[PDB]
Enzyme design. Structure first.
Site, PDB file in Angstrom:
ATOM      1  N   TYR A  16      -0.630  -8.446  -0.872  1.00 49.07           N
ATOM      2  CA  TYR A  16      -0.975  -6.769  -0.438  1.00 49.07           C
ATOM      3  C   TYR A  16      -1.166  -5.992  -1.942  1.00 49.07           C
ATOM      4  O   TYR A  16      -1.367  -4.888  -1.855  1.00 49.07           O
ATOM      5  CB  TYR A  16       0.102  -6.279   0.353  1.00 49.07           C
ATOM      6  N   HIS A  21      -3.979   0.417  -0.447  1.00 45.71           N
ATOM      7  CA  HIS A  21      -2.388   0.889   0.193  1.00 45.71           C
ATOM      8  C   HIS A  21      -1.295   0.891  -1.023  1.00 45.71           C
ATOM      9  O   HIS A  21      -0.193   1.038  -0.422  1.00 45.71           O
ATOM     10  CB  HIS A  21      -2.170   0.494   1.612  1.00 45.71           C
ATOM     11  N   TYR A  67       7.872  -3.225   4.965  1.00 45.51           N
ATOM     12  CA  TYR A  67       6.787  -2.882   5.689  1.00 45.51           C
ATOM     13  C   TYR A  67       6.292  -1.242   5.150  1.00 45.51           C
ATOM     14  O   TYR A  67       7.548  -0.432   5.256  1.00 45.51           O
ATOM     15  CB  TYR A  67       6.098  -3.094   6.981  1.00 45.51           C
ATOM     16  N   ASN A  69       5.478   1.161   7.003  1.00 44.94           N
ATOM     17  CA  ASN A  69       6.013   2.009   8.124  1.00 44.94           C
ATOM     18  C   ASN A  69       7.677   2.394   7.898  1.00 44.94           C
ATOM     19  O   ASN A  69       7.696   3.547   8.442  1.00 44.94           O
ATOM     20  CB  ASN A  69       5.792   1.460   9.429  1.00 44.94           C
ATOM     21  N   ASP A  94      -1.784   6.517  -2.554  1.00 46.45           N
ATOM     22  CA  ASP A  94      -3.210   6.395  -2.191  1.00 46.45           C
ATOM     23  C   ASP A  94      -3.515   7.566  -1.139  1.00 46.45           C
ATOM     24  O   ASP A  94      -2.705   7.799  -0.093  1.00 46.45           O
ATOM     25  CB  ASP A  94      -3.571   5.113  -1.611  1.00 46.45           C
ATOM     26  N   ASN A 115       0.744   6.432   6.795  1.00 48.34           N
ATOM     27  CA  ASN A 115       1.925   6.112   7.344  1.00 48.34           C
ATOM     28  C   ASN A 115       3.295   5.844   6.554  1.00 48.34           C
ATOM     29  O   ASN A 115       4.501   5.917   7.170  1.00 48.34           O
ATOM     30  CB  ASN A 115       1.820   4.809   8.399  1.00 48.34           C
TER      31      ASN A 115
END
Length: 188
Positions: A16, A21, A67, A69, A94, A115
């Site tokens: 990731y 993101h 994560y 969230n 971002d 989020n």
């Protein structure tokens, strides 16, 4: 108010690190590099931190380790740990609502479908916190930015990301040193 905290947002995992993101992280690492600090585990928040100073001023560079969230569940404890008030928190991220590469700065405002930001605004109990918004573009009229933010940049955008992060890193330093904006030229 005083103690300063710069948070870069992103998802964990080497898979990731390159995604749209995770610009916050890339810019975070960039700033830690600049200022010669290395990230260490923070057992009080669960996130990793880098400490140093930009031109005489004390900084706390942090990256959540959960994560996206759940960003706030670690950020909140982090601001609490260093007696850091929201007005003095700066989150890098971002932004789907800004042209790819365009960097704009502000305090308050919306989360732009982010989020990781909603989690932060939820955890700090306020939207007043500074943001270094870094435009990534947005899927075309009608929807699904979610999957788009989890994609890596196109080869075309890739040739620009390094430069955009250098500018976003500078914008952060400026914010900390002088406040407000005037680093918002047009990388339309």
């Amino acid at each position: 108010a005083e103690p300063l905290l710069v948070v870069g947002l992103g998802n964990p995992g080497a898979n990731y690190a390159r995604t749209r993101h995770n610009l916050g992280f890339v810019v975070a690492d960039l700033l830690a590099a600049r200022l010669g600090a290395k990230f260490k585990a923070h057992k009080r928040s669960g996130a990793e931190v880098a400490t140093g100073r930009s031109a005489g001023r004390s900084l706390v560079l942090a990256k959540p380790r959960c994560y996206m969230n759940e960003s706030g569940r670690q950020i909140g404890p982090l601001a609490k740990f260093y007696s850091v008030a929201p007005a003095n928190i700066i989150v890098i991220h971002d932004d789907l609502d800004l042209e790819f590469g365009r960097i704009r700065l502000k305090i308050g405002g919306g989360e732009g479908g982010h989020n990781g930001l909603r989690s932060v605004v939820a955890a700090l109990g306020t939207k007043d916190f500074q943001r270094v918004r870094i435009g990534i573009g947005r899927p075309p009229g009608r929807k699904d930015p979610a999957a788009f933010v989890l994609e890596n940049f196109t080869p075309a955008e890739r040739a620009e990301v390094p430069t955009i992060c250098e500018q976003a890193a500078d914008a952060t330093e400026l914010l900390i040193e002088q406040g407000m904006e005037p680093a918002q030229n047009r990388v339309h």
